[PDB]
Amino acid sequence: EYRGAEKKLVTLRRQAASHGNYYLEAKPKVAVVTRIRGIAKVNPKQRKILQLLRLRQIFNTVFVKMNKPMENMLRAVEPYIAYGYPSLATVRAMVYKRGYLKINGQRVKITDNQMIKDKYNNVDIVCAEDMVNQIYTCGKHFRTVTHGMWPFKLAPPAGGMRQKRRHFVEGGDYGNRDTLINRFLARMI
Amino acid sequence: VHSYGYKSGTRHLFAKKFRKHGVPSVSTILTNIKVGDYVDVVADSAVREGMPHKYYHGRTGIVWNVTPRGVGVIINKPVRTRTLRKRICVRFEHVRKSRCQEAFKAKEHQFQAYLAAKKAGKALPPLQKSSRLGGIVRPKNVEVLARRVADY
Amino acid sequence: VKPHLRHYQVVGRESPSEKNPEPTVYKFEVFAPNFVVAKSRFWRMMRVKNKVKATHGDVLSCKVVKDAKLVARNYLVDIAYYSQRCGYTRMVKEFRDVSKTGAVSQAYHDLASRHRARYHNIEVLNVKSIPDHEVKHLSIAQYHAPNLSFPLLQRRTKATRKDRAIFVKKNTKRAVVA
Amino acid sequence: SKNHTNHNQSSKNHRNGIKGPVPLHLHNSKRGSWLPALVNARRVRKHNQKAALKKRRERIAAFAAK
Amino acid sequence: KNRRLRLRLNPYVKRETAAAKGMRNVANRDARRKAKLARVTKAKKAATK
RNA sequence: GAUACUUUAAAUGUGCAAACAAACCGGCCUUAGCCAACUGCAAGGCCGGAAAGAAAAGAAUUAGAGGCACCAAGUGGGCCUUCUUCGGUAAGCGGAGCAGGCGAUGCGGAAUGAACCGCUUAGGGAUAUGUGGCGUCAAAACUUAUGGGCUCAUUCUCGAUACGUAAAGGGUGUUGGUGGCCACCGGCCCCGAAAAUGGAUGACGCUUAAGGCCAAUUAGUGAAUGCCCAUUAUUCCUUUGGUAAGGGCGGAAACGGAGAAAGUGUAGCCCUUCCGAUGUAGAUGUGGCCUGGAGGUUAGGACGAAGCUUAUGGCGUGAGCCUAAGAUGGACCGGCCUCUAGUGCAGAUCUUGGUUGGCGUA
RNA sequence: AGCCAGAACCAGCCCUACUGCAUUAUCCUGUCGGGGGUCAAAAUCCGGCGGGCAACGAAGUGCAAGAGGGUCUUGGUGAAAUGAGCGGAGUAUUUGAGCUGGCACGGGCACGCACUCUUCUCCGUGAUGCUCCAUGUUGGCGA
Numbered sequence A: 001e002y003r004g005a006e007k008k009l010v011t012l013r014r015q016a017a018s019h020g021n022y023y024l025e026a027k028p029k030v031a032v033v034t035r036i037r038g039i040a041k042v043n044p045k046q047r048k049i050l051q052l053l054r055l056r057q058i059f060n061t062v063f064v065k066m067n068k069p070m071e072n073m074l075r076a077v078e079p080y081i082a083y084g085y086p087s088l089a090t091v092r093a094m095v096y097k098r099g100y101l102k103i104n105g106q107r108v109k110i111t112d113n114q115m116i117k118d119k120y121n122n123v124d125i126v127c128a129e130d131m132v133n134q135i136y137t138c139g140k141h142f143r144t145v146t147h148g149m150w151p152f153k154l155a156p157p158a159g160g161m162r163q164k165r166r167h168f169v170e171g172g173d174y175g176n177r178d179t180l181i182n183r184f185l186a187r188m189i
Numbered sequence B: 001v002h003s004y005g006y007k008s009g010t011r012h013l014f015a016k017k018f019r020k021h022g023v024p025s026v027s028t029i030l031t032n033i034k035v036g037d038y039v040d041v042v043a044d045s046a047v048r049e050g051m052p053h054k055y056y057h058g059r060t061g062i063v064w065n066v067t068p069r070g071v072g073v074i075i076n077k078p079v080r081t082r083t084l085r086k087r088i089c090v091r092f093e094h095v096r097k098s099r100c101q102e103a104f105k106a107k108e109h110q111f112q113a114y115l116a117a118k119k120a121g122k123a124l125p126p127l128q129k130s131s132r133l134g135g136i137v138r139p140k141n142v143e144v145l146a147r148r149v150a151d152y
Numbered sequence C: 001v002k003p004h005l006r007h008y009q010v011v012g013r014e015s016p017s018e019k020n021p022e023p024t025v026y027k028f029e030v031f032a033p034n035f036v037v038a039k040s041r042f043w044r045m046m047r048v049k050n051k052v053k054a055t056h057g058d059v060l061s062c063k064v065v066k067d068a069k070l071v072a073r074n075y076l077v078d079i080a081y082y083s084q085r086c087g088y089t090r091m092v093k094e095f096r097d098v099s100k101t102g103a104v105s106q107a108y109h110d111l112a113s114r115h116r117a118r119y120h121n122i123e124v125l126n127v128k129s130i131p132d133h134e135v136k137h138l139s140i141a142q143y144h145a146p147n148l149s150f151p152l153l154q155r156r157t158k159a160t161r162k163d164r165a166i167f168v169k170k171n172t173k174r175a176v177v178a
Numbered sequence D: 001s002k003n004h005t006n007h008n009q010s011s012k013n014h015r016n017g018i019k020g021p022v023p024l025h026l027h028n029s030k031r032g033s034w035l036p037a038l039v040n041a042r043r044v045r046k047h048n049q050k051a052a053l054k055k056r057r058e059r060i061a062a063f064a065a066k
Numbered sequence E: 001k002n003r004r005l006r007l008r009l010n011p012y013v014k015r016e017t018a019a020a021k022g023m024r025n026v027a028n029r030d031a032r033r034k035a036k037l038a039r040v041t042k043a044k045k046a047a048t049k
Numbered sequence F: 001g002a003u004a005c006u007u008u009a010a011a012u013g014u015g016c017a018a019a020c021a022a023a024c025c026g027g028c029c030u031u032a033g034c035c036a037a038c039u040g041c042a043a044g045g046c047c048g049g050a051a052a053g054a055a056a057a058g059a060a061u062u063a064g065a066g067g068c069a070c071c072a073a074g075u076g077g078g079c080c081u082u083c084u085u086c087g088g089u090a091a092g093c094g095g096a097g098c099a100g101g102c103g104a105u106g107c108g109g110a111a112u113g114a115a116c117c118g119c120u121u122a123g124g125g126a127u128a129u130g131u132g133g134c135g136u137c138a139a140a141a142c143u144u145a146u147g148g149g150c151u152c153a154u155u156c157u158c159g160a161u162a163c164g165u166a167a168a169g170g171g172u173g174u175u176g177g178u179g180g181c182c183a184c185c186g187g188c189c190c191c192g193a194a195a196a197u198g199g200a201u202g203a204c205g206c207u208u209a210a211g212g213c214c215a216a217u218u219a220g221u222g223a224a225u226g227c228c229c230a231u232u233a234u235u236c237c238u239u240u241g242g243u244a245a246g247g248g249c250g251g252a253a254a255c256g257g258a259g260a261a262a263g264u265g266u267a268g269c270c271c272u273u274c275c276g277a278u279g280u281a282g283a284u285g286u287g288g289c290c291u292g293g294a295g296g297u298u299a300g301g302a303c304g305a306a307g308c309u310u311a312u313g314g315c316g317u318g319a320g321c322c323u324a325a326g327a328u329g330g331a332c333c334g335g336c337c338u339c340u341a342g343u344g345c346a347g348a349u350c351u352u353g354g355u356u357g358g359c360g361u362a
Numbered sequence G: 001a002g003c004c005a006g007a008a009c010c011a012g013c014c015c016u017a018c019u020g021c022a023u024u025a026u027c028c029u030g031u032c033g034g035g036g037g038u039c040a041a042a043a044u045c046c047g048g049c050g051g052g053c054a055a056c057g058a059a060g061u062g063c064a065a066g067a068g069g070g071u072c073u074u075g076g077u078g079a080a081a082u083g084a085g086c087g088g089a090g091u092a093u094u095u096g097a098g099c100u101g102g103c104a105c106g107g108g109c110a111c112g113c114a115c116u117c118u119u120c121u122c123c124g125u126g127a128u129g130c131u132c133c134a135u136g137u138u139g140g141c142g143a
């Protein structure tokens, strides 16, 4: 399915360019968000939003839907986060290497498909590739899959950052860096 | 500190709008209020009998009592760590019917109509599509966006 | 070595609506370190010239324009910059380089050194290669001379990183320490 | 000597949260309402209680029958 | 990183690895790139006419 | 108006609602409620129906268990900062609004600093980072680059880490820009610039910078991370506590080793698993430690009790407990379960006794 | 086997190895005319139309999937080694790339949806073991 989708998009772009028109990309549906500041001197409103996003510790990461209520929530905490649009390789790496489940209240590492099937009790989520597909394509069970997991706890980026206190556009780090979030996360996972 | 009366600091709150003075109208008189209705409490500065305190001037509540000329309303008010339910008594000139539930009532009505049509077997309307999808754009005008000498 | 700014073309429009079912499409040329900065500059230009916000807009295309073959040419660069005291000031300056991106990077460094002007306070109006007979400044014209030749004097030559030493014998090449 | 400020007060008030109001269906007393309607409602409620007692007796008899 | 864990979680990964090695093979890449360029330029030239 | 009062009118706010004691659709009962009357309206109930249990249109999210009591401590001198501000000529001055801090708190940076920057704390390894750095002091470019400009300053003196401790006006000193060899506008530098012990970019020093603006990562070769430093992040080992989560506990048989308690708390009944751990005033817990005496029980002592001494080790996170030696002593006393109190000392110009430097001095 | 060393192997973890697809056009190349300049003619530069891939490291454009070194940063030497890695059986299986025969996509199909090259495949050990501890090799020192 993935390979076919990519090929179809390539053909559509070629057909537009041949006659000199333009092809509009679909707006992104999924965002990946990581926290880049520690827990000190935070206002009550920002504190509440970060708690609701489950980002309670520096270098915690989550996946969210990129719709209007979520975007307006994300805009209010911009100095604290770095976010962007993930790729399939990034989603696979996060699930396979840093993925844990909420089982009985505990944080349990994923080690086989049987525990995934037992946690979810759904015929559409029985394996790690099912989880990957739901997260990547923003399918019907996006909330079920993401709510079922513990937030991702990542390491600091090897090689360093640029400037915590400035926006990415000003040569800093915080805010929306679009597809370039994948290079950032490859050094943290 | 020195002066704190019932109507202190209401110079702009209890005043009529520009070129809109006068007294309530027959539409206000002929409005029916039942127990259990949602109402807005808005003070009418030209009446002066049965006027609420300035705290309640923009709040919405539930009617709990109707008298020959008055209405009793329940309004939430936070005090220190809790929310109290205060009962205020006003004249009927100072309330309006609230439209805070129009969308919910409309949603229930549309659901009933859809159920009726689905049971009848009538054809359903075509569902709307998303505006965030892709497509090919055929342009009519293309321009050049630039900063020029004359701009400054 | 290589220039620190790339050349981008960004094409965009406002999202269609019942008021404007077919919006106008605009093309923009910018020099930026990456495409995110390029898109930021595009949306700023759209906001200040066409009253279109990024929150109601579509970006149709965003690519990097390739450089030509490396050849030594003269580049005229029309640029503008802001400061609080003077205000907004417009300059036209000639540079010697081998590519458009190289000339524009030169111009940015030059403005930073001689006027303390930073990237986000600068707009590039135009840049193009001009022939040899339109050069006005003699400091640039001197490089057209067909008999140009000069020696290298006062050189600071360092050894290869593997062969550097701290103490060496005075008239020889032997290293005593390191 | 006579200082006044509200500096820490909102922080204090939010530790155990601002509690929400009691739901509308609890503590719904009618005392102080317009008297004639109250007097009529009382008579209706008395008749309703009589009817409830009769209905229970009929149910018990029916179950005893079968 | 692990061979056993990766295969346990995704039993299909060996086929993907086979496809990867095939695509990295030099002769396959040369033929594929050469043929692909001819396939594209020819199709564009035909369609634009 | 006078010579700021106001039609208009934001940003940031603020009240209510968004299907399970609720609301929608039709029988019926009752009312000494309204209406000329009721088959209308109001109210309380009973019998039935429906129920994407809330679609599609960007069409929420949650380290999201709701409610209700009882008993009681400390506190009621605050102070600093950000953005608004009122008084005051001004103040490290007085008075307020919103939020964050210190007080009650260290750690890593800014040479130094309650409050700035980073980060917030069980006992330890490894890896990687933040703020800040990479001439020596001092870890890191053993003074990196196969990057571009600019700058020369003679008794406080070029300059060089924010918060934090000099103006008008001049200058052909040097580097560029606009318009017409001129007039104006810039960048660095120089005059303008005068105090009280000898002295401060932190010191030395630095000028093909070790300065100021911009930009890189081994360099027009051809592909994401130059390097160094935390009580932070990831991970591994051990402790402790949970609103903790699972499993075993009828001795399988035979004969490598032992053990195997139905359990709040222990030398924890035994395994496995997950998450938290700093703190002044203050609260509470502890098969938590120690002292004098009573009721029981179990022991010791002239082959040496109590007391005392210690480069006597061992055990315990700790309060402490136990052994060894006495080239010490000479008659009483240890453990465990209950009971009981005149029951634990470093400081109160504390009480009483004894010592002591000044001092072989005045 | 007590103490102190060195090397090997196994599990785990941590580093460095091995990498393809899209996009190039404001580009590449040949002529014609102009303009330029020299002691003459070339080039920088502009406009006509002929072709096109700058393709050995061509882009420093977007997204990428591809066993050698440590563990005095861990545990062990097979006292139930779950392994694509230890064992049994054969030689085929099915992953991609080229090339193949209704609907979709654009004003033909670059090759979406349905029905020759390139790689290893299938099968296996429950705990009448609830818990703990007891298992290599080579020297130095200790008679």
Ligand SMILES: [Mg+2]
Binding pocket: A161, A162, A163
């Ligand atoms: Mg940094």
Ligand SMILES: [Mg+2]
Binding pocket: none
């Ligand atoms: Mg800040």
Ligand SMILES: [Mg+2]
Binding pocket: none
């Ligand atoms: Mg105090």
Ligand SMILES: [Mg+2]
Binding pocket: none
């Ligand atoms: Mg602090």
Ligand SMILES: [Mg+2]
Binding pocket: F139
């Ligand atoms: Mg050093």
Ligand SMILES: [Mg+2]
Binding pocket: none
């Ligand atoms: Mg435990």
Ligand SMILES: [Mg+2]
Binding pocket: none
């Ligand atoms: Mg504590």
Ligand SMILES: [Mg+2]
Binding pocket: F342
């Ligand atoms: Mg006492």
Ligand SMILES: [Mg+2]
Binding pocket: none
């Ligand atoms: Mg004492």
Ligand code: NA
Binding pocket: F202
């Ligand atoms: Na210093």
Ligand code: NA
Binding pocket: F292, F342
């Ligand atoms: Na006593």
